Amino acid sequence: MLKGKKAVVTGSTSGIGLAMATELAKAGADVVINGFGQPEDIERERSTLESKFGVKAYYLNADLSDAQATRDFIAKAAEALGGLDILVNNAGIQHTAPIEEFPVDKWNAIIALNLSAVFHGTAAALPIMQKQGWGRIINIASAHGLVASVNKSAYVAAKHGVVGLTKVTALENAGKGITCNAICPGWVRTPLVEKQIEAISQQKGIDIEAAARELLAEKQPSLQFVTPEQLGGAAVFLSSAAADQMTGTTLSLDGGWTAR
Amino acid sequence: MLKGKKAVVTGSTSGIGLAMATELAKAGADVVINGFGQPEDIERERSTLESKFGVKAYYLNADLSDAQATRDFIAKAAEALGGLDILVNNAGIQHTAPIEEFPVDKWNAIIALNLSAVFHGTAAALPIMQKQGWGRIINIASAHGLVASVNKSAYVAAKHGVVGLTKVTALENAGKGITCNAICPGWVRTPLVEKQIEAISQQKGIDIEAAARELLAEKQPSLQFVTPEQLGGAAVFLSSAAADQMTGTTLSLDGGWTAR
Amino acid sequence: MLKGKKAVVTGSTSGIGLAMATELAKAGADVVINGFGQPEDIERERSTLESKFGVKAYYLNADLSDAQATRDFIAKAAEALGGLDILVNNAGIQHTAPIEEFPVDKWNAIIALNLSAVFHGTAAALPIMQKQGWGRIINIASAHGLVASVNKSAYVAAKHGVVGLTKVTALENAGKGITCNAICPGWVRTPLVEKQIEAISQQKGIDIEAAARELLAEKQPSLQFVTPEQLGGAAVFLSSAAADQMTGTTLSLDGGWTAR
Amino acid sequence: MLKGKKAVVTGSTSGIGLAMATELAKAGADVVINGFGQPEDIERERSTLESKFGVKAYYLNADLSDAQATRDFIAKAAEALGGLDILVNNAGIQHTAPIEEFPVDKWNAIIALNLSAVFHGTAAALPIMQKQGWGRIINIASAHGLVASVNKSAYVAAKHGVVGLTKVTALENAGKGITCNAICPGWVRTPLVEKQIEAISQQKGIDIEAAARELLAEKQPSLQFVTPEQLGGAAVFLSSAAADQMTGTTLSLDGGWTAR
Numbered sequence A, B, C, D: 001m002l003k004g005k006k007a008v009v010t011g012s013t014s015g016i017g018l019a020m021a022t023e024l025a026k027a028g029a030d031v032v033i034n035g036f037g038q039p040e041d042i043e044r045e046r047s048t049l050e051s052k053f054g055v056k057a058y059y060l061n062a063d064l065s066d067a068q069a070t071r072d073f074i075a076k077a078a079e080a081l082g083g084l085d086i087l088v089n090n091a092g093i094q095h096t097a098p099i100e101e102f103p104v105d106k107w108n109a110i111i112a113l114n115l116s117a118v119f120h121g122t123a124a125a126l127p128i129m130q131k132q133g134w135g136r137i138i139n140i141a142s143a144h145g146l147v148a149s150v151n152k153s154a155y156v157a158a159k160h161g162v163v164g165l166t167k168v169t170a171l172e173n174a175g176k177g178i179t180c181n182a183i184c185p186g187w188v189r190t191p192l193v194e195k196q197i198e199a200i201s202q203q204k205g206i207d208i209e210a211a212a213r214e215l216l217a218e219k220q221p222s223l224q225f226v227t228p229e230q231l232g233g234a235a236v237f238l239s240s241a242a243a244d245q246m247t248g249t250t251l252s253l254d255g256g257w258t259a260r
């Protein structure tokens, strides 16, 4: 459904980001992968996109925690793609600790990437989409953008802001043919959560995978993880014309996390 | 995208219901419509379905406001298709008036259909899906299942109820291959809506299309109606394996209505 | 605080409702209580209520599930008070049980009491509060009016309904000097809940005071029961002048229940 | 009554913060105000707080936008009041502008003061309350912490961030005797707002009162601004025992803003 569209995905050299660039390409969209890692992989990964889906893939490095760098990013990203229809702010970092102790430097880091990066990101993007008369800004928030969890102050503060920011963007460009929504995922066994499948498994020491099928049991009623492909799928739906009038809202995939 | 699957939509003889079945059929699925009207209009709609999408289309009458009648409906609808994977409880009605002047028979009439029917249609269908190991319950609430408007008590109550019933249904069958979600549409220009557009037309004694754009410019920030066709597309998505972990939540297609 | 103010509280011969009336009286209001029980016990509460707080207290039996009786109730209750400034629709019932197995009668009754009863009582009251230019309609919903939970479909539904209905009331009478909010309590150790604690203690075969701690843990993080006197104090406050602008919202007292 | 207890209110030299401190004092609590302004107007309000409520009112200058400054502030404040029982993080600023034109400097300033400040404030304040076993943290978010309005990206994002932070604060200190809640008020006629009123006045060609009516008209059903005094009443209620079990939730006084 997305043939001929130009999309950009932040933090997409791995995890949920990569799975998304994956599905958008499959939908027939040219994509601008972004993130960190061994140049080799990133290339094998970008290279592999044009192979599976027959679209054009481009890689641009950018530490999206820096406002200007981020803004200069999308601009170059757009230059490479020769346009900019779909922007998906996905890059993000997680840190655990009770407030009174949360490192001050970590707090600023999460806010700067998990939230601020979304704003500047959008800022630069909008003029282009506005000019065109069509656009899909897809912010990747999380359950923790609607509800809260212990010792994740910074992460929850950030995501809650992302969701809120999403609304503003939606209303501000209402009817313009442009939409902004925020996918709010649950438990996705990636490195960001694998660090918590082993942390919760050292305070009990019990099986490393028992601390997982347990990790879920406490938050996700489905007792099953949410696969990145599925998220990429949701990003594809948001980009369809079926969603022309779905703006400023949140789309949750959390095995029933928010239902209770 | 749904080849083989069997679907059912209450109140699908016209309006949003009909559009729902149409996209489910278009996606390759046998559907069972239902509703009121001139058998002539119903038969053409039922047949146009088998003709345009090359699938089996069954018609079943039932005054879903009747308990055993609706529960019976479900089973008889399961024999018609020879199984039952998707259920779209979309039947519903309306009445405008201030709380202290809302006929008690209207209050009832609404709660019976708009809320109770979803309950009876579910309980009847659940045992079936539970045995198949797969299932989809799509309840068509509204924006009035999240926020409220004047002189629509009954309707706002039942929707707020369908949303909460949706939540419960999702939790009781988590990880069983069955998901339950609520589509909370915004203004869709149907007859149920055309009735209020005309009431505004006369109240302010203004144009009929001038009274339309007004109804929008009050709740729908996009100033654009939500096409039934899109809602049928959002229903198709809730059926895709992409939404296997999307359960017990609402899917707002409202042009910004709940963003503010 | 409320010296002189004339209040009414459905289902107050016991538990939460009795508390709601107790703080109301304690705050200087004349109160009308109602509900089932032994005419002896009922007289005692009404009795104590009078001489302990120095205000008039009346009783009025009426089965609130009877739409017609309940309306005659407020008018009747209004006559004894010679006014009606505050209305608290508190009465309600529970019934644990899956969906495919929820007795249609158990659903009908909870819907008739927990939801419909609120509507009628409000319709029968608004008129009075409207003419005087001051009113307080305090609805007792529940966290389950905000989020769902297994085997409690009828309850969770009706509760969402109340929150939704509450909003409509507030909007229809906004500015008139009448406010409408919904108190949403967490676990309150009352007969209604003890009954569930006695089931968990039965199912798991553990100590009763233990099952109580286990009940709390699951949904209520504070691990401390919400107290009646508390919900009472909250109801009082909603009647203060600070609340004057607080209308059509939910006041949640659940020890974190809905925060996660 | 809060006699004995000690309280702190950021940004209280005027506006909502000032009315907040006046109510806690009237309740009998010794308070510490903070903010900017003319040392005479500051020292004036400070005096009235003692000469009118018979309590101790200390003053402390500090640019809450600075992480360390706010962390020492609560430090000195505690040492000043000889303790810290109630923290009211109120300090905040606004700036209207559409995402694409919203000043980067203007953004980071709003985030540092409308979100981060709440963080550090809470970070230094907790240790004290934790050791005491009792505490109250009152965050002054806004209706824009639940919903969104155009051209307020920074502000909306920050508020949600707060409503978000509020939850983690509560959860983390759940059952400890310390609660965290957020007051999300609607339009409160203050400078911050008179500025938005004078923008609609000179940008539409009409009275400064013609615009006010509109300001409310659009978002506030009650068509009446919320009074800074009422907010204080809320804050007082939150510090009461009636609210011992009310934690991690928002307390909205918007006049129906969020009900629709």
Ligand SMILES: NC(=O)c1ccc[n+]([C@@H]2O[C@H](COP(=O)([O-])OP(=O)(O)OC[C@H]3O[C@@H](n4cnc5c(N)ncnc54)[C@H](O)[C@@H]3O)[C@@H](O)[C@H]2O)c1
Pocket: A010, A011, A012, A013, A014, A015, A016, A017, A034, A035, A036, A037, A062, A063, A064, A065, A090, A091, A092, A093, A113, A114, A140, A141, A142, A143, A184, A185, A186, A187, A188, A189, A190, A191, A192, A193
């Ligand atoms: N893992 C989960 O359960 C889960 C749940 C909900 C939401 N999310 C979100 O999904 C998105 C990706 O998280 P993840 O799980 O994939 O973690 P990840 O570790 O798997 O991915 C982080 C991605 O961001 C890149 N990144 C590194 N530095 C960056 C920078 N300065 N700017 C931008 N990107 C940078 C990484 O190299 C990587 O590609 C995030 O914003 C996170 O909110 C994850």
Ligand SMILES: NC(=O)c1ccc[n+]([C@@H]2O[C@H](COP(=O)([O-])OP(=O)(O)OC[C@H]3O[C@@H](n4cnc5c(N)ncnc54)[C@H](O)[C@@H]3O)[C@@H](O)[C@H]2O)c1
Pocket: B010, B011, B012, B013, B014, B015, B016, B017, B018, B034, B035, B036, B037, B062, B063, B064, B065, B090, B091, B092, B093, B113, B114, B140, B141, B142, B143, B184, B185, B186, B187, B188, B189, B190, B191, B192, B193
């Ligand atoms: N129009 C909107 O803006 C809008 C917005 C939100 C939700 N909805 C919902 O969409 C669904 C359809 O509403 P609509 O706009 O299509 O109105 P409609 O008038 O267009 O459709 C009502 C459908 O129900 C059928 N119906 C008649 N009697 C019935 C009965 N006894 N039992 C079951 N169905 C019966 C009708 O024949 C028709 O097919 C509803 O539940 C309504 O909540 C509509």
Ligand SMILES: NC(=O)c1ccc[n+]([C@@H]2O[C@H](COP(=O)([O-])OP(=O)(O)OC[C@H]3O[C@@H](n4cnc5c(N)ncnc54)[C@H](O)[C@@H]3O)[C@@H](O)[C@H]2O)c1
Pocket: C010, C011, C012, C013, C014, C015, C016, C017, C018, C034, C035, C036, C037, C062, C063, C064, C065, C090, C091, C092, C093, C113, C114, C140, C141, C142, C143, C184, C185, C186, C187, C188, C189, C190, C191, C192, C193
């Ligand atoms: N216990 C909790 O944790 C909890 C939590 C949230 C909400 N609530 C609500 O508090 C309200 C009171 O519940 P409860 O815990 O006090 O149960 P309860 O058993 O303690 O009280 C029920 C009250 O309703 C009366 N009642 C009996 N038949 C009635 C009828 N036909 N019509 C009206 N009232 C009738 C009862 O005699 C009693 O006074 C309810 O609507 C329930 O939703 C309770």
Ligand SMILES: NC(=O)c1ccc[n+]([C@@H]2O[C@H](COP(=O)([O-])OP(=O)(O)OC[C@H]3O[C@@H](n4cnc5c(N)ncnc54)[C@H](O)[C@@H]3O)[C@@H](O)[C@H]2O)c1
Pocket: D010, D011, D012, D013, D014, D015, D016, D017, D018, D034, D035, D036, D037, D062, D063, D064, D065, D090, D091, D092, D093, D113, D140, D141, D142, D143, D184, D185, D186, D187, D188, D189, D190, D191, D192, D193
């Ligand atoms: N006015 C409204 O309608 C309204 C509505 C919702 C929320 N609020 C909130 O009320 C709180 C106060 O807003 P306001 O309306 O009173 O604006 P205000 O202009 O009236 O008050 C701003 C307060 O912050 C102080 N301030 C100055 N520099 C500061 C600094 N560096 N750090 C901290 N504080 C500083 C000011 O001196 C003043 O006391 C805010 O966080 C704002 O969210 C106001």
Ligand SMILES: [Ca+2]
Pocket: A147, A257, A258, A259, A260, C147, C258, C259, C260
């Ligand atoms: Ca929740």
Ligand SMILES: [Ca+2]
Pocket: B147, B257, B258, B259, B260, D147, D257, D258, D259, D260
């Ligand atoms: Ca709203």
Ligand SMILES: [Cl-]
Pocket: A148, A149, A150, C260, D171
């Ligand atoms: Cl947690």
Ligand SMILES: [Cl-]
Pocket: B148, B149, B150, C171, D260
């Ligand atoms: Cl309205």
Ligand SMILES: [Cl-]
Pocket: A171, B260, D148, D149, D150
């Ligand atoms: Cl707006």
